[PDB]
């Protein structure tokens, strides 16, 4: 049928994808 997720923001902060090493995705794009 149809299954789509929401605001990848489970109170946690989140940058790109998920909790951990996706946290390192900011310091590889910002730096």
């Amino acid at each position: 049928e149809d299954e789509n997720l929401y605001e990848k923001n489970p109170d946690s902060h989140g940058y790109d994808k998920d909790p951990a090493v996706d946290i390192w995705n900011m310091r590889v794009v910002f730096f």
Partner: protein, 54 residues
Amino acid sequence: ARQWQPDVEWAEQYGGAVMYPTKETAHWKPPPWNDVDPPKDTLVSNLTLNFGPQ
């Protein structure tokens, strides 16, 4: 689900007899899914000779 429109009607509009594009004409025939043997008519009532008062 959501991704695009892969609808049912795209199979029947491409539904294989003749692919009538811009008109409808004297179509052929819903061609056989198996190998092609509709016309099975082979029979005869064999010869009725009387070797009688010959």
